[PDB]
C-alpha cells in the first residue's frame, strides 16, 4: 500500500523562488503569484530543519538589499529639508517591504520565529539591518540629529516645518534606540541653552 | 461554624522520593515514586515506564524504602508518614484485581522530642533485621523485623550525639551497624555503632569516630565486596572501611553541593551523584585484588535539579525532581560532542514550587486559566493550566508532512465516507481505510501527479477533486472524469473553496464561479478584485434549496474579511482588520442560532460575527486570540450540532453552550489538519494530522488539565496580569557568580528589550532580580527590567491608583546585604508598560522590605517590615502615606475585600484590619491569638478568613458573632499535608459558594469552596461512612490524617470536608455504596457527588 513520493524537485526549485521573491518584494519588483502562492510555497517547502538555513538564505538576500540602500546615504549634502526626506522615504520603503515579506514569511514566524524565540524577528532583523547600514554608524546619524535639532529649533522660533517629518523621524529615533540611548542629550542640551537665552532675554 | 469543601484540582507532581526494586513481582523491576501523598508504582519496561498502580496515602510519605525479609518472595515496602505513620506494604495482584495489603503498621511519633534538623531519616538494615528511624534529636528508633510484628512496636536507643546529619546501615557486618555523620562543636565526625536488638542499646562500632570534612552531609553504605562507607562533603569525598582511608577532592564538585545519590551497580562500583545545580556525576570505585584502590568522579552531564535519582537499567536513570520536571534520561557510553553523556528520554510534568499564580480569563472566554510561577533556579517556568478535552488515538499511520484530509464515500451506496484523501506536496495519496485497517489503494478519477487543495463528495452522486492545476468532477459509480474545467490561461489555482453543490475557486486577483451539473461543470460568474485572494468559504448552511447564497473573502494589502453576494460576486460589505498578516482561513457556520463567520489572522486572532442571510453585513466584531501559528477551521457535525475545530499549536474545539460561544482546549500536542470521518469501523470520529503522522480518534466529554510550559530558566517569584496592556508582569530571579556573570541564558537576558534600574536612592554568587513583561498570547519576554544591585524584588501588583487612568506595574523591593538579617532599606517602584517599554513613573524609598502590596480602594497598601501602611497616589504621581499600622511581627501577606484588610503574619497568624475612611486610619478589628506561622491567607466571605500555617494545615478564622470581640475564632481546621504558597479567587470551570484555588510547594492545585449547613452535614455523614468502608493503604485513619497538627497542638478536623474522600465515593462498587448509604437512596448521593465534581 501507498508507495512513497519523491521530494527532490521540492527542495531545489525552492531557494531560487526564495531569492526572487525577496528580489520581487524588495525594490517593489512585481510578482506573478499575488503572494499567496508564495505563502503556500513557504508553508509547503519549508519543514523541519528547512527553516534555519532558509532564514540564512532570505536574510543574506535582504541584507545585501539593505546594504545596497547604503550608497545614496553616504553623502556630502547637508539638507535636512531633503536628506531627511530621503531617509524617511527609504524608511517607508523598508517598512512596506518588511511587512510584505512577513505577509509571505508569516509561516516562518508561526513555525520557528514566533514559535521559538532564538532569532531576531523579521521586524528585528530588518530594523538592525536598516539601522546598522543607513542610520547608525554613519555621518547620517550626526547629520540627522543636527538637522532635526535645526528643524525643531526653527520650529521653536515661530514657523512650523513639517509635523509629519518630525513625527516620523522621532519614530525612527525611538524605535532604533536613537531617541533613548544618547540622542535625547543633543535635544535636551540645545533646549537648555536656547531656552535659557529665551528666558533671560525676555525676562 | 464554617462549611468548607477542599478538593484536589491537580494532584501533587513533585517527586520527594523514589526507589527501585521487585515490588509487584520477583521478576518485575519497579520504580516506586513518592509524590507527596501519592505513591506511584511503575514497571521498568525496556522502554519508558508502564504505570500499574497509583495509591493515595493518608500521609506525606517521609520515608519510602523497599526491603526483602528472609523467605519473602518479593520486596515489601516500608513507608513512614510525616505524622509518623509507619507501615509495611506488600503488593498482591489477583488477576485483574490489585491490592496493597498492610503487612504491619503503627504510629511511631514520640509524644515529645525535638524533630531532628536534617529531617526524618529512615534506613533499613541490609539484612532486614530492623528499620532504623532518626526522627528526633538524641534518639534513634529501632523497629525490629525478626520479631515479626503487625503493630511495629519500636524502641528508642539513646544516641549520645544530638546533631546527626546522615546515617546508614553498613554492609558485611555480623551485627546491624550504623554509620552516621554528626556535628559537635569540635567539627564533624563519622561514628559507628552496633545495634543490639537483644540488649536494645548500642555497642562500640567496628571503626572508631573519625574527624571528617566540615560540610560532610552524605553517607553512602557500600556493598559487601568493599564494605565501609563513602562520606560526601562539599570539597571532598572520603571512603572509610576502618583502616582504609581513601580521600579525593575532585575540583568539579566544589561548585555545587551533592544532595542525592544512587548505587548503579549491585556491588557499588559506580554511583550517581546529583547536585543542587542539576549536574549528574558518576563516582567510580576501582577495585584491586577485594579492597578499594581509588575514587574517581566524572561529570556525566546535566539533568533537572534532582531530589532523588534512581538507576533503572540499560543506562536509563529516573531523575526525580521537586524543583523541575522529573526526568527519564539515558546515560550514553560516549559523550554527545558537548561533553555530556546524559540524554533526556522522557519528561514528567512537575508544577514545581508554585510560588505565585493568577487566574486570567485569557482568550476572552468564560473559563478561568491558571498561570503559575512554577519551579526554581534552572527549572523556573510559567505553567498555564486549563481544563481540556481528550480523545483516543485509534488509527495511526506515519506519513510525513500531510497537507490535506477529506472524507470520501468510495462505496456509492453508503452515506459513510469510507475513503480518505491526502495531498502532500504535488500529488494525492488515498487510503482505503477499510474497516479499522488502513492501506493506500487507488480510486479512479483522481490524479497522483498534482497537489489537491480540496476533494470530497458532491451532488448528483459525484465526487470532486480540486487540484493545483484544474478541477475534476468524477462520476462515482460508472468511471473516471466526464467533466473537467481548467483556467483559460492555465494558471494554477491559488485559493479554492467548494461545497456539495457548487464551486468557487480564486485565480490570483480574479475569482471564478462554477456550479456542478450531473456529468458537467458550468461556469457562470467572474470578478476582478483589487488584490489577491487569501481565503474563501461558500458553505451552504440552513440551505434548504440546494445552493449557498453567500461567500466571504480575505484579500492581501487591504486586510479585510469582506462579504460577497454569490450570484454576482459583488461587495456586500468590506470590513478591515489591521496588521500586515494575510488571513489564512475563513469560515462561516451556524452555532444553534444563525450564520456566523470565523476569520482569523496568522497569529491566532479570530473574529466571530453575526451574519445575516439577506444583507450579510458584518457587525458584532469581537476578537479572541487562539495560538500563535496561522490557523485553519474545519467543522465536524456532532450528535448535537456543528462543532468547529481550530488546528494550530494549541488545537481548540469551537462551539456554543447555552447560546454562548465557548473556546475549549484539546489536549493534543499539535494538529496540522482535521477532517470528520464516520466509517463503518469509525463512527463520528476525527482525523487529525500532524507533521509526522495521521492521528485518528473521537471526542471525550471528560476533561484533563492541559499544562503549557514556558521555560524561564530562572526562578520566577511573582506574577500579575495587566489586561489593558496584554501582558504578564513576572518577578524573576537569576543567580550570577563573579563584576558578575550569568551562569546560563535566562529569560530575563533574552528579552526583546531590556533596562536596568538607575535609582538615586541607595548609593561567591549573588541574586539578580528582573521584572519580566511577558506577552499573554505568545508568552515571549517583551521586556526585562533589571533591578538595582543587591535589590530583591519581593512583591508585585498590577493596578491603577488614585484617579489617573494608567495601569501600573508596582514592585516592592528590599536591599539585601549579607551584613544584616532583615533588610533596612527598600523601595516601591511604579512602572508603566507602554510602547513596548517599561518607564519608571515613580519611586519611594521605604525603610524595610516590602513583602506585600495589595491595591486597596484606589490606594496602594504595602507592608514594610513590620508596618502596614497605606499609600495614596497624588496628582503629581508619587506615593504619599495616609496611615500606618505597627502591631505586627512581620506583615507577610495582605488581602482585601472592601474596607477590610487581612494581614497574615510571620507568626501571629492573622489580623483583621479595617480602613475607616471617615477618619483616615486603620482599626484592628479582630485578631487570632494562636501562634500559627502563615504561608498564605485569603478572604472567603465578609467574615471567613482562610489561612495556611507552615505546618501544612488549613484553618478558617471567623470574626466572632466586649474586648473578646477582638478575638478571631478558628472555626475551621484541616491538615492539608501540602504547603500552600498562594490563594486566589477563580475557577477553571465555566451547591457551593465561591471558589478559591491554591498552589503548593509540591505542585498540588486545590480548591476550597463554601458549603451550606445542610449539604455540609450530609457530606460529613458520608465522610464518616466512607471512613467506615474505604480502607486506607497503611491502615491510617482519615480523621487522624486530616487532624490539625502542629508541634505544640493537635486537634481533629472540623468545618472542612475532604473532597477527595467524597469524590472517592464513585470509585467503589454498588454493594460498598449500599454499605455507605444504609440510613436516602444511593443514586441521590451519586448525583450529589457528580455535582460536587462539577466544580473542578
Curated annotation (Swiss-Prot), chain A:
Its post-translational modification remark reads: Neddylated; required for activity of cullin-RING-based E3 ubiquitin-protein ligase complexes. Deneddylated via its interaction with the COP9 signalosome (CSN) complex. (Microbial infection) Deneddylated by Epstein-Barr virus BPLF1 leading to a S-phase-like environment that is required for efficient replication of the viral genome.
Please, which domain of life does this record's source organism belong to?
Answer: Eukaryota
Q: How does it assemble?
A: Can self-associate. Component of multiple DCX (DDB1-CUL4-X-box) E3 ubiquitin-protein ligase complexes that seem to consist of DDB1, CUL4A or CUL4B, RBX1 and a variable substrate recognition component which seems to belong to a protein family described as DCAF (Ddb1- and Cul4-associated factor) or CDW (CUL4-DDB1-associated WD40-repeat) proteins.
Q: What family does this chain come from, according to its entry?
A: Belongs to the cullin family.
Its function, per the record, reads: Core component of multiple cullin-RING-based E3 ubiquitin-protein ligase complexes which mediate the ubiquitination of target proteins. As a scaffold protein may contribute to catalysis through positioning of the substrate and the ubiquitin-conjugating enzyme. The E3 ubiquitin-protein ligase activity of the complex is dependent on the neddylation of the cullin subunit and is inhibited by the association of the deneddylated cullin subunit with TIP120A/CAND1. The functional specificity of the E3 ubiquitin-protein ligase complex depends on the variable substrate recognition component.
Q: What is this protein called?
A: Cullin-4A
Q: Which organism is it from?
A: Homo sapiens
Please give the range of the full-length protein represented by this chain: 49 to 251 of 759
Curated annotation (Swiss-Prot), chain B:
Give the Phosphothreonine positions (modified residues).
1081
| Protein known as | DNA damage-binding protein 1
Q: Which organism is it from?
A: Homo sapiens
The gene name reads DDB1
- Alphabetically ordered keywords of this record: Acetylation, Biological rhythms, Cytoplasm, Disease variant, DNA damage, DNA repair, DNA-binding, Host-virus interaction, Intellectual disability, Isopeptide bond, Nucleus, Phosphoprotein, Repeat, Ubl conjugation, Ubl conjugation pathway
Localization terms from the record: Cytoplasm; Nucleus
Q: Where is this region: Interaction with CDT1 and CUL4A?
A: 762-1096
Q: In which pathway does it act?
A: Protein modification; protein ubiquitination
Listed GO molecular functions? Answer: cullin family protein binding; damaged DNA binding; DNA binding; protein-containing complex binding; protein-macromolecule adaptor activity; ubiquitin ligase complex scaffold activity; WD40-repeat domain binding
Q: Which disease is it linked to?
A: White-Kernohan syndrome: An autosomal dominant disorder characterized by global developmental delay, variably impaired intellectual development, hypotonia, and characteristic facial features. Some patients may have genitourinary and skeletal abnormalities.
Q: How does it assemble?
A: Component of the UV-DDB complex which includes DDB1 and DDB2; the heterodimer dimerizes to give rise to a heterotetramer when bound to damaged DNA. The UV-DDB complex interacts with monoubiquitinated histone H2A and binds to XPC via the DDB2 subunit. Component of numerous DCX (DDB1-CUL4-X-box) E3 ubiquitin-protein ligase complexes which consist of a core of DDB1, CUL4A or CUL4B and RBX1. DDB1 may recruit specific substrate targeting subunits to the DCX complex.
N-acetylserine: modified positions: 2
Amino acid at each position: 500500500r501507498d508507495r512513497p513520493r519523491l521530494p527532490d524537485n521540492y527542495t531545489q526549485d525552492t531557494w531560487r523562488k526564495l531569492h526572487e521573491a525577496v528580489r520581487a518584494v524588495q525594490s517593489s519588483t512585481s510578482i506573478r503569484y499575488n503572494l499567496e502562492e508564495l505563502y503556500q510555497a513557504v508553508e509547503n517547502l519549508c519543514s523541519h530543519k528547512v527553516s534555519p538555513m532558509l532564514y540564512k538564505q532570505l536574510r543574506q538576500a535582504c541584507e545585501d538589499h539593505v546594504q545596497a540602500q547604503i550608497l545614496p546615504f553616504r553623502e556630502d549634502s547637508l539638507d535636512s529639508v531633503l536628506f531627511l526626506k530621503k531617509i524617511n522615504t527609504c524608511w517607508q520603503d523598508h517598512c512596506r517591504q518588511m511587512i510584505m515579506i512577513r505577509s509571505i514569511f508569516l509561516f516562518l514566524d508561526r513555525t520557528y520565529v514566533l514559535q521559538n524565540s532564538t532569532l531576531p524577528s523579521i521586524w528585528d532583523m530588518g530594523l538592525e539591518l536598516f539601522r546598522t547600514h543607513i542610520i547608525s554608524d554613519k555621518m547620517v546619524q550626526s547629520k540627522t540629529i543636527d538637522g532635526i535639532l535645526l528643524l525643531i529649533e526653527r520650529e521653536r522660533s515661530g514657523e512650523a516645518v513639517d509635523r509629519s517629518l518630525l513625527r516620523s523621524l522621532l519614530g525612527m529615533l525611538s524605535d532604533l534606540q536613537v531617541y533613548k540611548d544618547s540622542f535625547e542629550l543633543k535635544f535636551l542640551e540645545e533646549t537648555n541653552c536656547l531656552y535659557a537665552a529665551e528666558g533671560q532675554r525676555l525676562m | 461554624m464554617s462549611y468548607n469543601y477542599v478538593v484536589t484540582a491537580q494532584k501533587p507532581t513533585a517527586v520527594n522520593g523514589c526507589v527501585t526494586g521487585h515490588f509487584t513481582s520477583a521478576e518485575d523491576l519497579n520504580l516506586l515514586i513518592a509524590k507527596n501523598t501519592r505513591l506511584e508504582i511503575y514497571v521498568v519496561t525496556a522502554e519508558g515506564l508502564r504505570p500499574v498502580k497509583e495509591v493515595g496515602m493518608y500521609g506525606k510519605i517521609a520515608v519510602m524504602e523497599l526491603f526483602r525479609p528472609k523467605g519473602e518472595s518479593k520486596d515489601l515496602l516500608f513507608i513512614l508518614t510525616a505524622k509518623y505513620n509507619a507501615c509495611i506494604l506488600e503488593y498482591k495482584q489477583s488477576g485483574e484485581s490489585i491490592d496493597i495489603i498492610t503487612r504491619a503498621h503503627g504510629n511511631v511519633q514520640d509524644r515529645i522530642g525535638r524533630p531532628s534538623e536534617t529531617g526524618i531519616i529512615g534506613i533499613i538494615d541490609p539484612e532486614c533485621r530492623m528499620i532504623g528511624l532518626r526522627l528526633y534529636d538524641g534518639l534513634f528508633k529501632v523497629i525490629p523485623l525478626d520479631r515479626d510484628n503487625k503493630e511495629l512496636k519500636a524502641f528508642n536507643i539513646r544516641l549520645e550525639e544530638l546533631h546527626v546529619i546522615d546515617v546508614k546501615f553498613l554492609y558485611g557486618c555480623q551485627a546491624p551497624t550504623i554509620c552516621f555523620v554528626y556535628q559537635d562543636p569540635q567539627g564533624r565526625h563519622v561514628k559507628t555503632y552496633e545495634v543490639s536488638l537483644r540488649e536494645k542499646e548500642f555497642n562500640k562500632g567496628p571503626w572508631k569516630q573519625e574527624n571528617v570534612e566540615a560540610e560532610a552531609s552524605m553517607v553512602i553504605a557500600v556493598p559487601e565486596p568493599f564494605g565501609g562507607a563513602i562520606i560526601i562533603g562539599q570539597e571532598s569525598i572520603t571512603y572509610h572501611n576502618g583502616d582504609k582511608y581513601l580521600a579525593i577532592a575532585p575540583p568539579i564538585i566544589k561548585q555545587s553541593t551533592i544532595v542525592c545519590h544512587n548505587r548503579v551497580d549491585p556491588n557499588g562500583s559506580r554511583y550517581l551523584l546529583g547536585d543542587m545545580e542539576g549536574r549528574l556525576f558518576m563516582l567510580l570505585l576501582e577495585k584491586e585484588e577485594v579492597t578499594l584502590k581509588d575514587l574517581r568522579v566524572e561529570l556525566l552531564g546535566e539533568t533537572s535539579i534532582a531530589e532523588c535519582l534512581t538507576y533503572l537499567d540499560n543506562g536509563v536513570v529516573f531523575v526525580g525532581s521537586r524543583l523541575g520536571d522529573s526526568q527519564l534520561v539515558k546515560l550514553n557510553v560516549d559523550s554527545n560532542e558537548q561533553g555530556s553523556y546524559v540524554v533526556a528520554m522522557e519528561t514528567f510534568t512537575n508544577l514545581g514550587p508554585i510560588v505565585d499564580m493568577c487566574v486570567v480569563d485569557l482568550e476572552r472566554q468564560g473559563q478561568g486559566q491558571l498561570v503559575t510561577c512554577s519551579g526554581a533556579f534552572k527549572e523556573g517556568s510559567l505553567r498555564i493550566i486549563r481544563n481540556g478535552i481528550g480523545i483516543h488515538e485509534h488509527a495511526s499511520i506515519d506519513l510525513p508532512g500531510i497537507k490535506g484530509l477529506w472524507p470520501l464515500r468510495s462505496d456509492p451506496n453508503r452515506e459513510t465516507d469510507d475513503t480518505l484523501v491526502l495531498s502532500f506536496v504535488g500529488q494525492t495519496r488515498v487510503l482505503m481505510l477499510n474497516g479499522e485497517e488502513v492501506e493506500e489503494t487507488e480510486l479512479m478519477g483522481f490524479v497522483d501527479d498534482q497537489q489537491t487543495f480540496f476533494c470530497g463528495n458532491v451532488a448528483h452522486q459525484q465526487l470532486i477533486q480540486i487540484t493545483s492545476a484544474s478541477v475534476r468532477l468524477v462520476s462515482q459509480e460508472p468511471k473516471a472524469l466526464v467533466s473537467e474545467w481548467k483556467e483559460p490561461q492555465a494558471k494554477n489555482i491559488s485559493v479554492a473553496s467548494c461545497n456539495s453543490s457548487q464551486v468557487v475557486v480564486a485565480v490570483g486577483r480574479a475569482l471564478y464561479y462554477l456550479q456542478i451539473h450531473p456529468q458537467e461543470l458550468r461556469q457562470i460568474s467572474h470578478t476582478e478584485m483589487e488584490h489577491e485572494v487569501a481565503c474563501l468559504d461558500i458553505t451552504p448552511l440552513g440551505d434548504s434549496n440546494g445552493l449557498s447564497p453567500l461567500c466571504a473573502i480575505g484579500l492581501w494589502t487591504d486586510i479585510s474579511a469582506r462579504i460577497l453576494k454569490l450570484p454576482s460576486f459583488e461587495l456586500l460589505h468590506k470590513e478591515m482588520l489591521g496588521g500586515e498578516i494575510i488571513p489564512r482561513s475563513i469560515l462561516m457556520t451556524t452555532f444553534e442560532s444563525s450564520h456566523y463567520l470565523l476569520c482569523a489572522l496568522g497569529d491566532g486572532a479570530l473574529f466571530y460575527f453575526g451574519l445575516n442571510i439577506e444583507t450579510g453585513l458584518l457587525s458584532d466584531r469581537k476578537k479572541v486570540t487562539l495560538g500563535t501559528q496561522p490557523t485553519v477551521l474545519r467543522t465536524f457535525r456532532s450528535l448535537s450540532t456543528t462543532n468547529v475545530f481550530a488546528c494550530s499549536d494549541r488545537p481548540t474545539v469551537i462551539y456554543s453552550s447555552n447560546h454562548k460561544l465557548v473556546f475549549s482546549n484539546v489536549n493534543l500536542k499539535e494538529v496540522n489538519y482535521m477532517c470528520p470521518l464516520n466509517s463503518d469501523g469509525y463512527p463520528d470520529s476525527l482525523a487529525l494530522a500532524n507533521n509526522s503522522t495521521l492521528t485518528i480518534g473521537t471526542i471525550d466529554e471528560i476533561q484533563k488539565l492541559h499544562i503549557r510550559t514556558v521555560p524561564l530558566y530562572e526562578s520566577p517569584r511573582k506574577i500579575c496580569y495587566q489586561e489593558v496592556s496584554q501582558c504578564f508582569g513576572v518577578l524573576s530571579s537569576r543567580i550570577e557568580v563573579q563584576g558578575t556573570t550569568a551562569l546560563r541564558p535566562s529569560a530575563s537576558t533574552q528579552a526583546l528589550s531590556s533596562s536596568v534600574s538607575s535609582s538615586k536612592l541607595f548609593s561567591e554568587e549573588v541574586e539578580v532580580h528582573n521584572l519580566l513583561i511577558i506577552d499573554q498570547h505568545t508568552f515571549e519576554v517583551l521586556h526585562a527590567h533589571q533591578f538595582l544591585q543587591n535589590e530583591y524584588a519581593l512583591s508585585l501588583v498590577s493596578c491603577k491608583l488614585g484617579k489617573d487612568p494608567n495601569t501600573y506595574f508596582i514592585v516592592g523591593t528590599a536591599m539585601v546585604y549579607p551584613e544584616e538579617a532583615e533588610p533596612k532599606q527598600g523601595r516601591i517602584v511604579v512602572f508603566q508598560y507602554s510602547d513596548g517599554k517599561l518607564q519608571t513613573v515613580a519611586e519611594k524609598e521605604v525603610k524595610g522590605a516590602v513583602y506585600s502590596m495589595v491595591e486597596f480602594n484606589g490606594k496602594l497598601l504595602a507592608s514594610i517590615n513590620s508596618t502596614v501602611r497605606l499609600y495614596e497616589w497624588t496628582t503629581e504621581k508619587e506615593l504619599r502615606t495616609e496611615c500606618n499600622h505597627y502591631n505586627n511581627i512581620m506583615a507577610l501577606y495582605l488581602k482585601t475585600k472592601g474596607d477590610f484588610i487581612l494581614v497574615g503574619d510571620l507568626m501571629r497568624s492573622v489580623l483583621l484590619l479595617a480602613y475607616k475612611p471617615m477618619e483616615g486610619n486603620f482599626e484592628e478589628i479582630a485578631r487570632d491569638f494562636n501562634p500559627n506561622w502563615m504561608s498564605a491567607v485569603e478572604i472567603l466571605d465578609d467574615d471567613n478568613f482562610l489561612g495556611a500555617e507552615n505546618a501544612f494545615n488549613l484553618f478558617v478564622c471567623q470574626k466572632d458573632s466586649d474586648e473578646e470581640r477582638q478575638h478571631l475564632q478558628e472555626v475551621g481546621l484541616f491538615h492539608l499535608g501540602e504547603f500552600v504558597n498562594v490563594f486566589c479567587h477563580g475557577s477553571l470551570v465555566m451547591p457551593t459558594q465561591g471558589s478559591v484555588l491554591f498552589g503548593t510547594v509540591n505542585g498540588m492545585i486545590g480548591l476550597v469552596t463554601s458549603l451550606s449547613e445542610s449539604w455540609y452535614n450530609l457530606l460529613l455523614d458520608m465522610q464518616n461512612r466512607l471512613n467506615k468502608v474505604i480502607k486506607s493503604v497503611g491502615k491510617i485513619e482519615h480523621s487522624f490524617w486530616r487532624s490539625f497538627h502542629t508541634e505544640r497542638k493537635t486537634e481533629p478536623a472540623t468545618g472542612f470536608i475532604d473532597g477527595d474522600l467524597i469524590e472517592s465515593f464513585l470509585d467503589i462498587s454498588r454493594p460498598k455504596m449500599q454499605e455507605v448509604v444504609a440510613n436516602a437512596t444511593a443514586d441521590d448521593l451519586i448525583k450529589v457527588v457528580e455535582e460536587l465534581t462539577r466544580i473542578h
